[PDB]
């Protein structure tokens, strides 16, 4: 029973607001007396965000926190975000911090529309700095997050979809993940590589679940595995990654470099139709932490 | 993708209940806490416990109920099927609009997995045709709840009790009647053979058509009875005209008649999949319902 699970969303739900500018509406995040939303809410295509921002008043921004309307007492631009100062502090803001998530790591997304939380799901920051999210028109300002004890770590705010169907956005300081810009010009994600650390954790999960048909007695070095991995657009494995896999190595008695020799043969010979935990595809959005926790 | 409902309205209802050295989670709604009755058990979890006997031997004082840091006072108690109802001195201020509902096989819900009264994860899953859940539940998760939220009202449908030897899970509704043939005793128990939820696979095939995946359609069609002959051979639930009517709205938005889709699925079952993918997966997904496909 190994499932993609999201963090409970309640602490974040109390922070979700609707921000409207003229006719374009999206979501904002209300912490203390400040509200964060994508800056492209002030748009009507090569926009000059300094020029459009100077042309706006505090009254132009309609901020609705559920029933009640909040008044912007001031505003400023932080990279690709706006920070709206509001007259009132959210009584429900939790202990929180902003963090910059790293490729391979996961977080939960609270998909919201019109300031109302709609659904919650888990995904991963891919190596090409996009995410395979679920985002419809109106979802901008939806936030991705992790929770550790009582503290919410915010790491993502949604801005855009790319032509490949995947998604791009920023941390909570407004810096984009990846080389993307918030204008609707042609933009392309880089070639997506596979999160090798996560495929390896999934193989440990499978071995723990009772299918070990893919294990072998061949051996590999870290360097000779990385050389093969990159030919197949898998991420090279670091020695920190080997260390992170230690507990699953011990629990199963399969050395990390031996699991790499298994993976190596799967890359080179494919799966002649066989399945691992039920699919002909190696899953790369389950971390070593997820396998350990289940 | 599978999405869970936002868990906030449920998270405020989660508390910790301890009897002796046994701890699990409880659901606190107004002035009463609901929780699995085997919280009053110790070593003889496995021994056929007499729960009427174990309960007559207890006082309100033996139930330690904590809502975070604050301890609530048990004013009374009673058993309802496999649940305990604890009357608490204080009424939960965070109590949402809610009802108790008994879900049917094939229907989906969200699980808030809890430990020591503290929410820790949320996910979507389906009630299996054999009345088990394919959940993710560890020691201490009992009393975790399943629910749907449409729209301001929480529909509680599941409370967790136990894990079968096969790793699937079993529990009750919130009036404490088990789903399936199970009893709350640490004896080894088998579910009936599980099946694939045909109504859900068909709903998902409509979902695939909408987001671009059309490779699997074909010019053929079939009748209800021709299709069920192939489904029974592959361990799929039979399809009925109610199912077809349920799929009606999904026929319109697609322009694909329900029994054309059955022909497409029949080919996918008889032909397998080329190793290619449908909406991302290499297996026929049966835990998204028609009602899920419309919402998302
Ligand atoms: C913000 O609500 C929205 C999120 C997009 C909406 C479609 N799916 C999403 O994730 N962002 C935009 O609409 C974005 C605006 C730029 C100024 C950042 N435009 C965009 O992503 O173009 C791609 C696209 C637009 C509409 C439908 C599908 C793809
Ligand atoms: C309550 O926290 C716990 C959750 C179970 C155990 C770990 N994973 C879970 O889903 N439930 C029990 O421990 C339960 C208590 C009985 C008195 C109902 N016992 C149990 O699940 O034993 C495992 C088992 C049950 C039935 C057949 C075979 C094994």
Coordinates of C-alpha atoms and ligand atoms in Angstrom, one line a residue:
Chain A
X1 CA 0.0 0.0 0.0
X2 CA 2.3 2.8 -1.3
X3 CA 0.4 6.0 -2.1
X4 CA 1.1 9.5 -3.2
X5 CA -0.2 11.4 -0.2
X6 CA -0.5 15.2 0.3
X7 CA 0.0 17.1 3.5
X8 CA -3.2 18.1 5.3
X9 CA -4.2 21.5 3.7
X10 CA -6.0 23.2 6.6
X11 CA -3.3 25.6 7.7
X12 CA -3.0 26.8 4.0
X13 CA -6.7 26.9 3.4
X14 CA -7.0 29.7 6.0
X15 CA -4.6 31.8 4.0
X16 CA -6.3 31.6 0.5
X17 CA -7.9 34.8 -0.9
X18 CA -9.2 36.0 -4.2
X19 CA -7.4 39.0 -5.9
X20 CA -9.2 40.7 -8.7
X21 CA -7.9 43.5 -11.0
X22 CA -10.4 44.7 -13.6
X23 CA -11.6 41.6 -15.3
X24 CA -8.7 39.1 -14.6
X25 CA -8.9 37.2 -11.3
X26 CA -6.7 34.7 -9.5
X27 CA -5.6 33.6 -6.0
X28 CA -3.5 35.2 -3.3
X29 CA -1.8 34.0 -0.1
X30 CA -2.7 36.1 3.0
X31 CA 0.0 36.0 5.7
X32 CA -0.2 38.6 8.5
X33 CA -1.0 42.0 6.9
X34 CA 0.5 41.1 3.5
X35 CA -1.1 39.2 0.5
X36 CA 1.0 37.6 -2.2
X37 CA -0.2 36.9 -5.8
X38 CA 1.3 36.7 -9.2
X39 CA 2.0 40.1 -10.6
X40 CA 0.4 39.3 -14.0
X41 CA -3.0 39.9 -12.3
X42 CA -2.4 43.6 -13.3
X43 CA -2.4 42.6 -17.0
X44 CA -4.9 43.0 -19.8
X45 CA 2.4 40.1 -24.1
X46 CA 5.7 41.9 -23.6
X47 CA 4.2 43.7 -20.6
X48 CA 6.2 46.4 -18.7
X49 CA 5.4 45.4 -15.2
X50 CA 7.0 48.6 -13.8
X51 CA 4.8 50.7 -16.1
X52 CA 1.6 48.8 -15.3
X53 CA 2.3 48.8 -11.6
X54 CA 2.8 52.6 -11.4
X55 CA -0.5 53.0 -13.2
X56 CA -2.4 51.3 -10.4
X57 CA -4.0 52.5 -7.1
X58 CA -4.6 50.6 -3.9
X59 CA -8.3 50.7 -4.8
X60 CA -7.8 48.9 -8.1
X61 CA -7.1 45.6 -6.3
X62 CA -10.2 43.8 -5.1
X63 CA -9.2 41.4 -2.4
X64 CA -11.9 39.1 -1.0
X65 CA -11.1 36.7 2.0
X66 CA -14.2 34.6 1.8
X67 CA -17.1 36.8 2.5
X68 CA -15.3 40.0 3.7
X69 CA -13.4 42.4 1.5
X70 CA -9.9 43.5 2.5
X71 CA -8.5 47.0 1.7
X72 CA -5.0 47.3 0.2
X73 CA -3.2 49.9 2.4
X74 CA -0.2 49.7 0.0
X75 CA 1.5 47.6 -2.6
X76 CA 4.9 46.7 -4.1
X77 CA 6.5 44.4 -6.5
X78 CA 8.8 41.6 -5.5
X79 CA 10.3 40.0 -8.7
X80 CA 7.3 38.2 -10.3
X81 CA 5.1 38.6 -7.2
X82 CA 3.0 41.5 -5.8
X83 CA 2.9 42.1 -2.1
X84 CA -0.3 43.8 -1.2
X85 CA -0.4 45.4 2.3
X86 CA -3.9 44.9 3.8
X87 CA -5.5 46.8 6.7
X88 CA -6.1 43.6 8.7
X89 CA -3.9 40.7 9.8
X90 CA -5.1 37.2 9.0
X91 CA -6.0 35.6 12.3
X92 CA -5.3 32.2 10.8
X93 CA -1.8 32.7 9.5
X94 CA 0.3 29.7 10.8
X95 CA 4.0 29.4 11.7
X96 CA 5.5 29.5 8.3
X97 CA 8.6 30.2 6.1
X98 CA 9.5 30.6 2.5
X99 CA 11.9 28.0 1.0
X100 CA 13.3 27.3 -2.4
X101 CA 12.5 23.7 -3.3
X102 CA 15.2 21.7 -5.2
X103 CA 14.7 19.3 -8.1
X104 CA 13.6 15.8 -7.0
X105 CA 11.9 17.1 -3.9
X106 CA 8.1 16.9 -3.5
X107 CA 5.5 19.2 -2.0
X108 CA 1.7 19.4 -1.8
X109 CA -0.3 21.7 -4.1
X110 CA -3.6 23.3 -2.9
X111 CA -5.4 23.9 -6.2
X112 CA -7.7 27.0 -5.7
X113 CA -10.1 28.8 -7.9
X114 CA -11.6 32.2 -7.0
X115 CA -9.9 32.1 -3.6
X116 CA -11.7 28.9 -2.7
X117 CA -9.5 25.8 -2.1
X118 CA -10.6 23.1 -4.6
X119 CA -8.3 20.1 -4.2
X120 CA -5.0 19.0 -2.8
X121 CA -2.3 16.7 -4.4
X122 CA 1.4 15.9 -4.3
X123 CA 4.0 16.5 -7.0
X124 CA 7.7 17.0 -7.5
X125 CA 10.0 19.8 -8.8
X126 CA 11.3 18.2 -12.0
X127 CA 15.0 18.6 -13.0
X128 CA 13.9 20.9 -15.9
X129 CA 12.3 23.2 -13.1
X130 CA 8.7 22.5 -14.2
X131 CA 6.0 20.5 -12.4
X132 CA 3.4 18.1 -13.8
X133 CA 0.6 19.8 -12.0
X134 CA -3.2 20.0 -12.5
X135 CA -4.0 23.7 -13.1
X136 CA -6.9 25.2 -15.0
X137 CA -7.6 28.8 -16.0
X138 CA -8.0 30.7 -12.7
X139 CA -5.5 28.6 -10.7
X140 CA -2.7 31.1 -10.6
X141 CA -1.7 32.0 -7.1
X142 CA -2.3 28.4 -6.0
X143 CA 0.5 27.5 -3.7
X144 CA 2.7 24.4 -3.1
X145 CA 3.9 23.6 0.4
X146 CA 5.3 21.2 2.9
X147 CA 4.6 20.9 6.7
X148 CA 7.2 20.0 9.4
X149 CA 5.6 19.8 12.8
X150 CA 3.6 23.0 13.1
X151 CA 5.5 25.0 10.5
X152 CA 4.3 25.5 6.9
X153 CA 7.2 25.8 4.3
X154 CA 5.8 27.5 1.3
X155 CA 7.8 26.8 -1.9
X156 CA 5.8 27.4 -5.0
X157 CA 3.3 29.8 -6.4
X158 CA 1.6 28.9 -9.7
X159 CA 2.0 31.3 -12.7
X160 CA 1.7 29.5 -16.1
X161 CA 1.4 26.4 -18.2
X162 CA 3.9 25.6 -21.0
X163 CA 2.9 24.2 -24.4
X164 CA 4.0 20.7 -23.2
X165 CA 1.2 20.6 -20.6
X166 CA 3.5 21.1 -17.6
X167 CA 3.6 24.0 -15.2
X168 CA 5.9 26.8 -14.1
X169 CA 5.9 29.3 -11.3
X170 CA 8.0 30.9 -8.5
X171 CA 9.1 30.7 -4.9
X172 CA 7.4 33.1 -2.5
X173 CA 10.0 35.7 -3.2
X174 CA 8.9 35.8 -6.8
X175 CA 11.9 34.2 -8.4
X176 CA 10.8 31.7 -11.1
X177 CA 11.9 28.1 -11.0
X178 CA 13.7 27.6 -14.3
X179 CA 14.4 30.0 -17.2
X180 CA 10.7 31.1 -17.5
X181 CA 9.2 34.5 -17.7
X182 CA 5.6 35.6 -17.0
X183 CA 4.7 36.7 -20.5
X184 CA 2.7 34.6 -22.9
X185 CA 5.5 34.2 -25.5
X186 CA 6.6 30.8 -26.8
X187 CA 8.4 29.1 -24.0
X188 CA 9.7 25.5 -23.8
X189 CA 10.8 23.4 -20.9
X190 CA 14.2 21.8 -21.3
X191 CA 14.4 18.1 -22.0
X192 CA 13.1 16.4 -18.8
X193 CA 15.5 14.1 -17.2
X194 CA 14.4 11.3 -14.8
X195 CA 14.9 11.7 -11.0
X196 CA 17.2 8.7 -10.6
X197 CA 17.2 8.9 -6.8
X198 CA 13.4 8.5 -6.9
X199 CA 13.4 5.6 -9.3
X200 CA 15.9 3.9 -7.0
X201 CA 13.6 4.5 -4.0
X202 CA 10.7 3.0 -6.0
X203 CA 12.8 -0.1 -6.8
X204 CA 13.5 -0.4 -3.0
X205 CA 9.8 0.0 -2.4
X206 CA 9.1 -2.8 -4.9
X207 CA 11.7 -5.1 -3.4
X208 CA 10.1 -4.4 0.0
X209 CA 6.7 -5.3 -1.6
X210 CA 7.9 -8.7 -2.9
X211 CA 8.9 -8.3 -6.6
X212 CA 12.6 -8.6 -7.1
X213 CA 12.7 -10.1 -10.6
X214 CA 14.9 -7.2 -11.8
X215 CA 17.7 -7.7 -9.3
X216 CA 21.0 -9.1 -10.6
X217 CA 24.5 -10.0 -9.5
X218 CA 26.3 -7.6 -11.8
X219 CA 28.2 -4.8 -10.2
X220 CA 28.7 -1.2 -11.1
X221 CA 30.7 1.8 -9.9
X222 CA 29.0 5.1 -9.3
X223 CA 30.9 6.6 -12.3
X224 CA 30.1 3.8 -14.7
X225 CA 26.5 4.0 -13.7
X226 CA 26.3 7.8 -14.1
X227 CA 27.8 7.4 -17.6
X228 CA 25.0 5.0 -18.6
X229 CA 22.3 7.0 -16.8
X230 CA 23.0 10.2 -18.8
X231 CA 22.8 8.4 -22.1
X232 CA 19.2 7.6 -21.1
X233 CA 18.3 11.1 -19.8
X234 CA 18.4 10.0 -16.1
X235 CA 20.0 12.2 -13.6
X236 CA 23.6 11.3 -12.5
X237 CA 23.7 9.9 -8.9
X238 CA 25.7 11.8 -6.3
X239 CA 27.4 10.3 -3.3
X240 CA 24.9 12.2 -1.1
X241 CA 22.2 10.3 -3.0
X242 CA 23.9 7.0 -2.2
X243 CA 24.0 8.1 1.5
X244 CA 20.3 9.1 1.4
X245 CA 19.4 5.5 0.2
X246 CA 21.3 3.9 3.1
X247 CA 18.3 3.0 5.3
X248 CA 16.5 1.3 2.4
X249 CA 19.8 -0.4 1.5
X250 CA 20.0 -1.8 5.1
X251 CA 16.3 -2.8 5.5
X252 CA 16.5 -4.8 2.2
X253 CA 20.1 -5.9 2.3
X254 CA 20.6 -4.7 -1.2
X255 CA 23.6 -2.4 -1.6
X256 CA 22.9 0.9 -3.4
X257 CA 25.4 0.2 -6.2
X258 CA 23.7 -3.2 -6.6
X259 CA 20.3 -1.5 -7.1
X260 CA 22.1 0.7 -9.6
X261 CA 23.2 -2.4 -11.5
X262 CA 19.6 -3.5 -11.5
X263 CA 18.5 -0.1 -12.8
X264 CA 21.3 0.0 -15.4
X265 CA 20.0 -3.3 -17.0
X266 CA 16.5 -2.0 -17.0
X267 CA 17.7 1.1 -18.9
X268 CA 19.7 -0.9 -21.4
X269 CA 17.4 -3.9 -22.0
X270 CA 14.0 -2.2 -21.2
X271 CA 11.3 -4.3 -19.6
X272 CA 10.2 -7.0 -22.0
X273 CA 6.6 -6.3 -20.8
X274 CA 7.2 -7.1 -17.2
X275 CA 5.8 -4.9 -14.5
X276 CA 7.2 -3.3 -11.3
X277 CA 4.5 -2.5 -8.7
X278 CA 2.0 -2.7 -11.5
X279 CA 3.3 -0.6 -14.4
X280 CA 5.7 -0.8 -17.3
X281 CA 7.0 2.7 -16.3
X282 CA 9.5 3.5 -13.6
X283 CA 8.0 6.0 -11.2
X284 CA 10.2 9.0 -10.3
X285 CA 8.0 11.2 -8.0
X286 CA 8.3 9.0 -4.8
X287 CA 11.2 10.1 -2.7
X288 CA 13.4 7.9 -0.4
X289 CA 11.5 9.6 2.4
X290 CA 8.1 8.4 1.2
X291 CA 9.2 4.8 0.9
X292 CA 10.8 5.0 4.4
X293 CA 7.6 6.5 5.9
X294 CA 5.5 3.6 4.4
Chain B
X1 CA -4.8 13.1 -11.5
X2 CA -6.2 11.8 -8.2
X3 CA -7.0 14.8 -6.0
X4 CA -8.2 14.8 -2.4
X5 CA -10.6 17.3 -1.0
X6 CA -9.0 20.0 1.2
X7 CA -8.9 18.5 4.7
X8 CA -9.3 21.6 6.8
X9 CA -12.9 21.1 8.0
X10 CA -12.0 17.6 9.0
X11 CA -8.6 18.4 10.6
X12 CA -10.3 20.6 13.3
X13 CA -12.3 17.5 14.4
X14 CA -9.4 15.2 15.0
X15 CA -8.5 14.3 18.6
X16 CA -6.5 11.6 20.5
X17 CA -8.2 9.0 22.7
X18 CA -6.2 6.7 25.0
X19 CA -7.4 3.8 27.2
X20 CA -4.5 2.5 29.3
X21 CA -1.7 2.1 26.8
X22 CA -3.9 2.0 23.7
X23 CA -4.1 5.2 21.6
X24 CA -6.0 6.0 18.4
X25 CA -7.8 8.9 16.8
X26 CA -11.3 10.2 17.4
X27 CA -13.7 12.3 15.5
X28 CA -15.1 15.2 17.7
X29 CA -18.4 16.7 16.5
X30 CA -20.3 19.0 18.8
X31 CA -20.2 17.4 22.2
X32 CA -19.4 13.8 21.2
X33 CA -16.2 12.0 20.2
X34 CA -16.4 9.0 17.9
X35 CA -13.7 6.4 17.8
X36 CA -13.1 2.7 17.2
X37 CA -14.2 0.6 20.2
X38 CA -11.0 -1.5 20.3
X39 CA -9.3 1.5 22.1
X40 CA -10.7 -0.2 25.2
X41 CA -8.6 -3.3 24.5
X42 CA -5.1 -4.3 25.6
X43 CA -3.4 -7.7 25.1
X44 CA -6.6 -9.5 24.0
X45 CA -7.0 -7.6 20.8
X46 CA -6.7 -11.0 19.2
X47 CA -8.7 -13.0 21.7
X48 CA -12.3 -12.7 20.7
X49 CA -12.8 -9.7 23.1
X50 CA -16.2 -9.3 24.6
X51 CA -16.7 -5.6 24.1
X52 CA -19.8 -5.5 26.2
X53 CA -17.7 -7.0 29.0
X54 CA -14.7 -4.7 28.5
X55 CA -17.0 -1.6 28.4
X56 CA -19.1 -2.4 31.5
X57 CA -15.7 -2.4 33.4
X58 CA -14.9 1.2 32.4
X59 CA -15.7 4.7 33.7
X60 CA -15.7 8.0 32.0
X61 CA -12.5 8.6 33.9
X62 CA -10.6 5.9 32.0
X63 CA -10.9 7.7 28.7
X64 CA -8.1 10.3 28.1
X65 CA -9.3 12.5 25.3
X66 CA -7.0 15.3 24.1
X67 CA -7.7 18.0 21.5
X68 CA -4.1 19.1 20.9
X69 CA -2.9 20.3 24.3
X70 CA -6.3 20.6 26.0
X71 CA -7.8 17.6 27.7
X72 CA -11.5 17.2 27.3
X73 CA -13.7 15.7 30.1
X74 CA -15.8 12.6 29.2
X75 CA -19.3 13.1 30.7
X76 CA -20.7 9.7 29.5
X77 CA -20.2 6.9 27.0
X78 CA -22.0 4.3 25.0
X79 CA -21.3 1.8 22.3
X80 CA -22.8 1.8 18.8
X81 CA -21.8 -1.2 16.8
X82 CA -18.0 -1.1 16.5
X83 CA -17.7 2.5 17.6
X84 CA -17.6 4.3 20.9
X85 CA -19.5 7.6 21.5
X86 CA -17.9 9.7 24.2
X87 CA -19.9 12.6 25.5
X88 CA -17.5 15.4 26.1
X89 CA -17.9 18.4 28.5
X90 CA -17.2 20.9 25.7
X91 CA -18.7 21.3 22.2
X92 CA -16.1 21.5 19.4
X93 CA -16.2 25.1 18.1
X94 CA -14.7 24.0 14.8
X95 CA -17.6 21.5 14.0
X96 CA -18.5 21.8 10.3
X97 CA -21.8 21.3 8.7
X98 CA -21.7 17.5 8.3
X99 CA -23.6 14.3 7.8
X100 CA -22.9 10.6 8.2
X101 CA -23.4 8.6 5.0
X102 CA -22.8 5.0 3.9
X103 CA -20.9 4.9 0.6
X104 CA -21.5 2.3 -2.0
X105 CA -18.8 0.1 -3.7
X106 CA -17.0 2.0 -6.5
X107 CA -17.5 5.4 -4.9
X108 CA -14.5 7.5 -4.0
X109 CA -13.7 9.5 -0.9
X110 CA -10.7 11.3 0.8
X111 CA -8.8 9.8 3.7
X112 CA -7.2 12.0 6.4
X113 CA -4.7 9.7 7.9
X114 CA -4.0 10.6 11.5
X115 CA -1.6 9.6 14.2
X116 CA -1.9 10.4 17.9
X117 CA -4.8 12.7 17.0
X118 CA -2.6 14.7 14.7
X119 CA -3.4 14.8 10.9
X120 CA -0.4 13.7 8.9
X121 CA -1.6 13.0 5.3
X122 CA -4.5 13.1 2.9
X123 CA -5.3 11.0 -0.2
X124 CA -8.1 9.8 -2.4
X125 CA -9.2 6.2 -2.7
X126 CA -12.2 4.1 -3.6
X127 CA -14.4 1.6 -1.8
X128 CA -13.5 -1.7 -3.5
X129 CA -16.3 -4.1 -4.7
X130 CA -15.2 -6.5 -2.0
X131 CA -15.7 -3.8 0.7
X132 CA -12.0 -3.2 1.5
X133 CA -10.0 0.0 0.9
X134 CA -6.6 0.1 -0.7
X135 CA -5.3 2.5 1.8
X136 CA -2.0 3.6 3.4
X137 CA -2.4 3.0 7.2
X138 CA 0.2 2.3 9.8
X139 CA 0.1 1.6 13.5
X140 CA -1.8 4.3 15.3
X141 CA -4.0 5.3 12.3
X142 CA -7.3 3.8 13.6
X143 CA -10.0 6.4 13.9
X144 CA -8.8 8.2 10.8
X145 CA -11.8 9.2 8.7
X146 CA -12.9 9.1 5.1
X147 CA -15.1 11.9 3.7
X148 CA -16.4 13.9 0.8
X149 CA -17.0 17.6 1.0
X150 CA -19.2 18.8 -1.8
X151 CA -20.0 21.6 -1.2
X152 CA -19.9 23.2 2.3
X153 CA -21.0 20.0 4.0
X154 CA -18.7 17.2 5.0
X155 CA -20.0 13.7 4.3
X156 CA -18.2 11.4 6.7
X157 CA -18.3 7.8 5.3
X158 CA -15.4 5.7 6.7
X159 CA -13.6 5.2 10.0
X160 CA -10.5 3.1 9.9
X161 CA -10.2 -0.1 12.0
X162 CA -7.8 -2.6 10.6
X163 CA -5.5 -4.1 7.9
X164 CA -6.1 -7.5 6.3
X165 CA -3.2 -9.9 5.7
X166 CA -3.2 -8.9 2.0
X167 CA -2.5 -5.3 3.0
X168 CA -5.9 -3.8 2.2
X169 CA -7.9 -2.1 4.8
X170 CA -11.3 -2.3 6.5
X171 CA -13.4 -0.1 8.6
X172 CA -16.9 1.2 9.3
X173 CA -19.2 4.0 8.6
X174 CA -19.8 6.5 11.3
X175 CA -22.7 4.5 12.8
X176 CA -20.0 1.8 13.3
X177 CA -21.3 -0.9 10.9
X178 CA -18.4 -2.5 9.1
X179 CA -18.1 -2.4 5.3
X180 CA -17.9 -6.0 4.3
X181 CA -17.8 -9.3 6.2
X182 CA -15.2 -8.3 8.7
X183 CA -15.2 -8.2 12.5
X184 CA -13.0 -6.0 14.7
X185 CA -10.8 -8.7 16.2
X186 CA -7.1 -9.4 15.5
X187 CA -7.9 -12.6 13.7
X188 CA -6.8 -13.2 10.1
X189 CA -9.8 -12.5 7.8
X190 CA -10.2 -12.7 4.0
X191 CA -12.2 -10.4 1.8
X192 CA -14.0 -11.7 -1.2
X193 CA -12.2 -11.7 -4.6
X194 CA -11.8 -8.1 -5.9
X195 CA -12.9 -6.9 -9.3
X196 CA -12.3 -3.9 -11.5
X197 CA -14.9 -1.1 -11.2
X198 CA -16.1 -1.1 -14.8
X199 CA -18.1 2.1 -14.3
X200 CA -15.0 3.9 -13.2
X201 CA -12.8 2.6 -16.0
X202 CA -15.3 3.9 -18.5
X203 CA -15.5 7.3 -16.8
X204 CA -11.7 7.5 -17.0
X205 CA -11.7 6.6 -20.7
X206 CA -14.0 9.6 -21.2
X207 CA -11.6 11.6 -19.1
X208 CA -8.8 10.5 -21.5
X209 CA -10.8 11.5 -24.6
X210 CA -11.2 15.0 -23.1
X211 CA -7.5 15.7 -22.4
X212 CA -6.3 14.4 -25.8
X213 CA -5.8 10.6 -25.4
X214 CA -7.9 9.1 -28.2
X215 CA -5.6 6.4 -29.6
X216 CA -7.8 3.6 -28.1
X217 CA -11.1 4.4 -29.7
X218 CA -12.4 2.3 -32.7
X219 CA -15.1 2.4 -35.3
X220 CA -16.8 -0.7 -33.8
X221 CA -19.6 -0.9 -31.3
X222 CA -21.1 -3.6 -29.1
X223 CA -24.2 -4.4 -27.1
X224 CA -24.5 -4.6 -23.3
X225 CA -24.7 -8.4 -23.3
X226 CA -21.8 -8.9 -25.7
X227 CA -19.6 -6.6 -23.6
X228 CA -20.4 -8.2 -20.2
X229 CA -19.3 -11.6 -21.6
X230 CA -15.8 -10.2 -22.2
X231 CA -15.8 -8.3 -18.8
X232 CA -16.7 -11.4 -16.8
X233 CA -13.8 -13.2 -18.4
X234 CA -11.5 -10.4 -17.2
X235 CA -12.8 -9.8 -13.7
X236 CA -14.8 -6.6 -14.4
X237 CA -18.1 -5.8 -12.8
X238 CA -21.1 -6.2 -15.1
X239 CA -22.5 -3.0 -16.7
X240 CA -26.2 -2.0 -16.3
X241 CA -28.5 0.5 -18.0
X242 CA -28.3 2.6 -14.8
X243 CA -24.5 2.7 -15.3
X244 CA -25.1 3.8 -18.9
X245 CA -27.5 6.6 -17.8
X246 CA -24.9 7.6 -15.2
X247 CA -22.4 7.8 -18.2
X248 CA -25.0 9.8 -20.2
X249 CA -23.6 13.2 -19.5
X250 CA -20.1 12.0 -20.3
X251 CA -21.5 10.7 -23.7
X252 CA -22.7 14.2 -24.6
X253 CA -19.6 16.1 -23.8
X254 CA -17.6 13.5 -25.8
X255 CA -20.1 12.7 -28.5
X256 CA -19.1 9.1 -27.9
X257 CA -22.0 6.7 -27.2
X258 CA -21.6 4.6 -24.1
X259 CA -21.5 1.3 -25.9
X260 CA -18.9 2.6 -28.4
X261 CA -16.7 3.2 -25.4
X262 CA -17.4 -0.4 -24.2
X263 CA -16.1 -1.6 -27.6
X264 CA -13.0 0.5 -27.1
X265 CA -12.5 -1.0 -23.6
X266 CA -13.2 -4.6 -24.9
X267 CA -10.4 -4.1 -27.4
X268 CA -8.1 -2.8 -24.6
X269 CA -8.9 -5.8 -22.5
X270 CA -8.6 -8.3 -25.3
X271 CA -5.6 -6.6 -26.9
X272 CA -3.8 -5.3 -23.9
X273 CA -1.9 -2.0 -24.1
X274 CA 0.9 -1.6 -26.6
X275 CA 3.0 -0.5 -23.6
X276 CA 1.7 3.0 -24.4
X277 CA -0.3 5.1 -22.0
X278 CA -3.7 6.4 -21.3
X279 CA -3.8 9.8 -19.5
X280 CA -0.4 9.0 -18.1
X281 CA -0.9 5.5 -16.8
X282 CA -0.1 2.1 -18.3
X283 CA -3.1 0.4 -16.4
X284 CA -6.8 0.9 -16.7
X285 CA -7.6 3.1 -13.7
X286 CA -10.8 2.3 -11.8
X287 CA -10.7 4.7 -8.8
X288 CA -12.0 7.8 -10.6
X289 CA -15.8 7.9 -10.7
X290 CA -18.0 9.7 -13.3
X291 CA -18.7 12.3 -10.6
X292 CA -15.0 12.8 -10.2
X293 CA -14.4 13.2 -13.9
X294 CA -17.0 15.9 -14.0
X295 CA -15.7 17.8 -11.0
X296 CA -12.1 17.7 -12.2
Ligands
LIG1 C1 -3.1 31.9 -14.3 O1 -4.4 31.7 -13.9 C2 -2.9 31.0 -15.6 C3 -2.6 29.5 -15.2 C4 -2.7 28.7 -16.5 C5 -4.1 28.9 -17.1 C6 -4.1 27.7 -18.0 N1 -3.4 26.6 -17.2 C7 -2.6 27.3 -16.3 O2 -1.8 26.7 -15.5 N2 -1.7 31.6 -16.4 C8 -1.9 32.1 -17.6 O3 -2.9 32.1 -18.1 C9 -0.5 32.6 -18.3 C10 -0.4 34.1 -18.2 C11 1.0 34.5 -18.4 C12 1.1 36.1 -18.4 C13 2.0 34.1 -17.2 N3 -0.6 32.1 -19.7 C14 -0.2 30.8 -20.1 O4 0.1 30.0 -19.4 O5 -0.4 30.6 -21.4 C15 -0.5 29.1 -21.6 C16 -1.8 28.6 -21.6 C17 -2.8 29.6 -21.4 C18 -4.2 29.1 -21.4 C19 -4.5 27.8 -21.5 C20 -3.4 26.9 -21.6 C21 -2.1 27.3 -21.7
LIG2 C1 -5.4 0.7 14.5 O1 -4.4 1.8 14.6 C2 -4.8 -0.4 13.7 C3 -4.4 0.1 12.3 C4 -4.1 -1.2 11.4 C5 -2.9 -1.9 12.0 C6 -1.7 -1.4 11.3 N1 -2.3 -1.0 9.9 C7 -3.6 -0.8 10.1 O2 -4.3 -0.5 9.2 N2 -5.7 -1.5 13.8 C8 -5.4 -2.7 14.4 O3 -4.2 -2.9 14.8 C9 -6.4 -3.8 14.4 C10 -7.2 -3.8 15.7 C11 -8.1 -5.0 15.7 C12 -8.7 -5.3 17.1 C13 -9.3 -4.7 14.8 N3 -5.7 -5.0 14.2 C14 -5.2 -5.3 13.0 O4 -5.3 -4.5 12.0 O5 -4.6 -6.5 12.9 C15 -4.1 -6.9 11.6 C16 -5.0 -7.8 11.0 C17 -6.3 -7.7 11.1 C18 -7.2 -8.7 10.5 C19 -6.6 -9.8 9.8 C20 -5.2 -9.9 9.7 C21 -4.4 -8.9 10.3

